[PDB]
Amino acid sequence: SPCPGACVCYNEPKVTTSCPQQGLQAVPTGIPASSQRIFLHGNRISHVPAASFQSCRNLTILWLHSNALARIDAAAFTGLTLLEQLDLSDNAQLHVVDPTTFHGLGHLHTLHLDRCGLRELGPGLFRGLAALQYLYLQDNNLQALPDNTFRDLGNLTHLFLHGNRIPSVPEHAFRGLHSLDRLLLHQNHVARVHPHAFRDLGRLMTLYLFANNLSMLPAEVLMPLRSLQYLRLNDNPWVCDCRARPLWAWLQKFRGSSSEVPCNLPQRLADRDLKRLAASDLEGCALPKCC
Template sequence: MKRAIAEGSSDSTVISLGEIITVDRILSRKPQGSKLLILVLCLNIQSEVESCPGACVCYSEPKITISCQQQGLTAIPTEIPIQSQRIFLHNNKITLVRSTSFTSCRNMTILWIHSNNISLIEPGAFYGLNKLEELDLSDNTNLKSINPVTFRGLVHLHTLHLDRCGLMELSTGLFRGLFSLQYLYLQDNNLQNLLDDTFIDLANLTYLFLHGNKIKSLSENVFRGLINLDRLLLHQNRVSLVHRRSFHDLGKVMTLYLFNNNLTVLTGETMAPLVSLQYLRLNGNQWICDCQARSLWNWFKQFKGSSSELECHLPPHLAGRDLKRLQSSDLEGCIDSFNQIRTSVFSTKTRSGKLATGSPPLSSHDGSMKCCQPEMDKSFIYEAKGKAGPSSHSSRPSSNNPLKDKENMSKTKYVETDPSKNGSNKQINDSPFGTFPSIVDPPLTKLRPEFLEPIEPSTVPTKKRQGCSKKNKSKAQCRLTQQGNSSTLQLSLSLLIPPLVWSLLLLC
């Protein structure tokens, strides 16, 4: 009887030994009609799992799961059962996700492919996986870029791991249509810029992890649409500029990390939209604590949450002090931060060995008001280093008009602080953890005298004229004397030539 039941079952039917024994006992006690009914029920018992891939372990509780991690796989198995709900393929050597890899897995809710060698995901690889809720692609360091249509149709996806994938950029529309997404992990990549409206469709996103990248600035609409965001982690980047409206949609953010960046100035207007903020970390930046910091200082007066220290870097007499604990009188003056920064350029190198960038910290994309302007000519600072002329990041662009250029060269050089005029958006620091030394550099007044001597205008010819005697009282007299000397020489030559000619004729 046991053999008959086993032989009569379909290929997909698997009946345990205990079930066969139980059915055998029931059949031995029941009439013939009941035996046939029970036999039909047994034949319709569904299998727990269809055929399991050779290198995998399959089980059905609590959900139908295919586990193939750490098996040395170089490709995704082709015989994955169609009823699989959870598929674990992490810690293998898979290099490619084909467009046909999961076409039959329409019931899948969790897919882990992290810690592989994936370098390409073909468009359509996740097409039709309408029930997918969690996708982990992290730790695939060769991925670098993802096609913008890769995640289309994943309307129930709530968690997406893309951390440590070597991503260089986020394609326009990459997260389009992911209306259910709540957790997005993008940390520890090579992202340098974030485009406006990158996250426009992620209205339900609550956690956004962007730390450990190389992001340099935050534009006006970079976070537009994140109306329910709770946690934003941007620490350990290279952020030196935050647009005054960057956070305009982040009214529900409770945690903001911006520590270990290249910030020098952050306005209170920028922070104002963060009305729910409770935890703020801004340490590890190079804060300038003068009039530029007053609006942020005022904002902290009404901030009720928890904050790290904001250690002042400039001016020197406030170095090391917490901006939040300063008195109003400490912020009344405007330091010549331009001079202080140039001093740092002379004596400070970044960790990469390059000189720190030197644009004044007052510049901003949005043209916000600047509280102080340099009052003296700064051109000698550039030319004191071997008279090489201004560096490219501080000189204004040529107007392609020779007459105009010559006129500008004859005028006193003035370094513009408005990027709309000089076209340069570089900030003071460009390394992840700052470029300033722990000891503040001395002001320019302590430089050696030879660096403080006025430099000749750039229009002075390279040829040196013959110097005049100190006895001359004016340049005009000097020129007359030089002309007189020239005339005397000519007369002497004219008197000597005839005797020489006669002497030659006599010799002949």
């Protein structure tokens, strides 16, 4: 009932404890348990100990973005069964989130983890988040996209993975993402995508793969994308020879909107758009399956 010194407390529209840009070193004590929204963004909170908000059982929105988060306890968010929105973004030194941290958050809808310097996504990190719809993981330091990382995210519609260093996409990286509408994998180091990586992405409408390291792409990887409407493949070292014929054939039938597919090789077809090429331009080689 009394508001912490660095905070503003009001009841409408939701019970809110707001303490942004107050130079707070840690989570302020005495936050009203009736709080539905807590805003602690813009401080210098470095650690989030266990049960830091356990008394706030009605908490649905928690902002911790733009702090100095270096360590989050695995039980930091226990008791927050009604939490819908969690923001931990803009904490470039966070590096690693404990795989148990998000467990039990069955009402979570949006999870902001953009710019957190995340080195990896540990096993079971997004386990049981069946209500999650928006997952922000851009501008981190990811080096892998392990199988079944998002297996339980059946309600996920937006997945942001751009601005990382993911080298490849394995077969079961995106298994279970039946509701996925937009998938942003641009500005990574993707050198190869498994032929069946997008098997469950039949409702996907937007796929960004530009600014990667793709020289070739099996046409079978695009086949499950029945609902695709937007595709970006530019800024990739595409090799426009015989190996590009399957991808070429698919692009000729694609009724959606695709970007340029710039040929890096051969020298003759440099920066020509692959989809705008004739079939005759795609003969001969320039190790692949057709040479």
